[PDB]
Amino acid sequence: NIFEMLRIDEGLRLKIYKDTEGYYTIGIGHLLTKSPSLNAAKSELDKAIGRNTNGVITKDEAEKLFNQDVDAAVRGILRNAKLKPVYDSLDAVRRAALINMVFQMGETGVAGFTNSLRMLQQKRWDEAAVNLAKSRWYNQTPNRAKRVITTFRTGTWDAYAA
Amino acid sequence: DEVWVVGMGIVMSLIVLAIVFGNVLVITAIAKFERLQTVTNYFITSLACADLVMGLAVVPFGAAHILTKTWTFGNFWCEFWTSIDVLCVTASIETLCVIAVDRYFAITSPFKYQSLLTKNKARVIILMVWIVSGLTSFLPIQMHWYRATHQEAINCYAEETCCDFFTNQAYAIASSIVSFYVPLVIMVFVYSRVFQEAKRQLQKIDKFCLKEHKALKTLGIIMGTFTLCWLPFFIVNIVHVIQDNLIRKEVYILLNWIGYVNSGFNPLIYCRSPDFRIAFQELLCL
Ligand SMILES: CC(C)NC[C@H](O)COc1cccc2[nH]c3ccccc3c12
């Protein structure tokens, strides 16, 4: 399912680390905070967790946080007036692809593509893919972009599992 | 492809069952029957133990890794697993080498075809084999001496869902030479001399049983097989040390798995011996 998708694309790390932006991140794609300070990240983390983690957390915990982030993700996608119509017209699969794009690029970032969303809502896949392939997101991470896009056109998990 | 993953699941399940079944058979036959108890079959017992640990501990998790296209067992068990793997292979080659040497010193002693070592010496030798094997496998792996310094390998190490073996050129070369090549050359030379001797005898006057020469042919078969299975793999290691990525990962994995499949060939090779055959058919209620 979707959890598997994200679990693959982003990846899962047991110990605190800095992401591609240099910000503090742990578990699957969970942002502790944006700051060079490890102490601020520790505060954020402990606030998200039950007790002091020192920066090390259990797989289970990581999954808990991932769930919180997915919840918050879905809520965000629903509240956004631009994204809402598109997400409602997409089947569970493409919905998952979308939730992926929102995990990586965030609400605003995803709302960045007007025509992509427009056609996704119009059930026109190929053209949409052609639009997403010329994007910045695709250029930055051509692998995840290619997989997600392929997921949009195919509407299947065949891109993440053979 | 779920259809593909199931097919592979069935194939590799048949593989694992074959390995476990066979080596278990060998060990049981060797341990139960007093007629089958000799230094040679003690070494064979060590070998079948190595291949057994290969069957239960390693192959299944590798299969799971390839099928699921990812590692679900966590870094800890990834590392320990690799340790188990290298340990097994090393112990195996060392065992075969020891066997070769034993046969050499046994054929050529004034009393011929007789091996000078009693039982408690053999056990000691095996124990030492496993000790130095785990010494050249676990230590380097548990001390993280193999680990590469590039960002890819580091990401794969810190990643719990990623199990991949990345080795700095140094570890690749050193470990592949010490754990494989040297004892290989040793075995080859020694056993070649053993065949030369066997031929210098068989043409000589009576009497020395042919069954023993057939046995030398059998052992020769075990060794030949092992070397032929693992050779392509250990060659490619040095290949990637010289020029890396000159060979596809898939191919690497393939040769790797050839080496794996080798672990189940021994039980079928021991059938050459009338003794092991009678024993086998005995345990099977035939
Ligand atoms: C798929 C992995 C985890 N298993 C690798 C090979 O089966 C055997 O590995 C070895 C056994 C003995 C000595 C060795 N030296 C090496 C150097 C590089 C890679 C593997 C080995 C190796």
Nearest to B239 by CA among B176, B156, B153: B176
Return the H-helix or E-strand segment holding B204: none
Q: What backbone torsions phi and psi does residue B159 show, to the nearest 5 degrees? A: -80, 125
Alpha-carbon distance of B42 to B23, in angstroms, equals 13
| Domain ranges across chain B | 1-286
Nearest to B269 by CA among B237, B221, B235: B221
Alpha-carbon distance of B228 to B32, in angstroms, equals 31
Rg over alpha carbons for chain A, rounded to the nearest Å, is 16
Q: Is B67 left (phi over 0), alpha (psi -120 to 50) or beta?
A: alpha
Contact B161 A12 (CB under 8 A): yes
B201-205's contacts with Cβ under 8 Å and 24+ in sequence apart are B201/B107, B201/B112
Closest CB from A11, A161, A162 relative to B159: A11
Helices B74-107 and B182-202 pack at an angle, to 10 degrees, of 30
B159 touches chain A (CB under 8 A): yes
Nearest CA in chain B to A157: B1
Q: For ligand 1, pick from B85, B164, B169, B229 the residue to mutate: most ligand atoms within 8 Å of CB.
A: B85
Asked if B56 and B36 count as a contact pair (C-beta separation under 8 A), the reply is: no
Q: CB neighbours of A87 closer than 8 A, spacing ≥ 6?
A: A77, A78, A95, A98
Inter-CA distances, A131 with A83, A137, A153, B271, Å: 17, 11, 12, 65
What single string gives the DSSP state of each residue in chain A? -HHHHHHHHT--EEEEEE-TTS-EEEETTEEEESSS-HHHHHHHHHHHSSS--TTB--HHHHHHHHHHHHHHHHHHHHH-TTHHHHHHHS-HHHHHHHHHHHHHHHHHHHHT-HHHHHHHTTT-HHHHHHHHHTSHHHHHSHHHHHHHHHHHHH-SGGGT--
Q: How was this structure determined?
A: X-ray
* CATH of segment(s) B1-286: 1.20.1070.10
User: Resolution for this model in angstroms, one decimal place?
Assistant: 4.0
Nearest to A104 by CA among A32, A33, A10: A10
**Three-class SS state of B159:** strand
Q: Whose CA is nearest to atom 17 of ligand 1?
A: B172
Inter-CA distances, B127 with B46, B80, B123, B131, B136, Å: 9, 21, 6, 6, 14
| Domain ranges across chain A | 1-162
Alpha-carbon distance of B115 to B39, in angstroms, equals 8
Q: Whose CA is nearest to atom 19 of ligand 1?
A: B172
* CATH of segment(s) A1-162: 1.10.530.40
A61 is catalytic: no
* Beta strands at A30-33 and A13-18: parallel, antiparallel or unpaired: unpaired
Asked if B270 and B218 count as a contact pair (C-beta separation under 8 A), the reply is: yes
